[PDB]
UniProtKB/Swiss-Prot annotation:
Epithelial cell-specific Ca(2+)-regulated actin-modifying protein that modulates the reorganization of microvillar actin filaments. Plays a role in the actin nucleation, actin filament bundle assembly, actin filament capping and severing. Binds phosphatidylinositol 4,5-bisphosphate (PIP2) and lysophosphatidic acid (LPA); binds LPA with higher affinity than PIP2. Binding to LPA increases its phosphorylation by SRC and inhibits all actin-modifying activities. Binding to PIP2 inhibits actin-capping and -severing activities but enhances actin-bundling activity. Belongs to the villin/gelsolin family. The gene is VIL1. Monomer. Homodimer. Associates with F-actin; the association with F-actin is inhibited by tropomyosin. It comes from Gallus gallus (Chicken). It is found in: Cytoplasm, Cytoskeleton; Cell projection, Microvillus; Cell projection, Lamellipodium; Cell projection, Ruffle. It comes from the Eukaryota. Specifically expressed in epithelial cells. Component of brush border microvilli. Residues 29-32 are annotated as: Absolutely required for activity. This is Villin-1. The chain holds residues 792 to 826 of 826 of the full protein.
Amino acid sequence: LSDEDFKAVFGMTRSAFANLPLWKQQHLKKEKGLF
């Protein structure tokens, strides 16, 4: 994903996303249908 894609998809920056606990990364992806 591009940096702006991360912002559009997750409502936070790439680095912010990568800094979340893994359960939370997984949940934020799964609720959108992502892997």
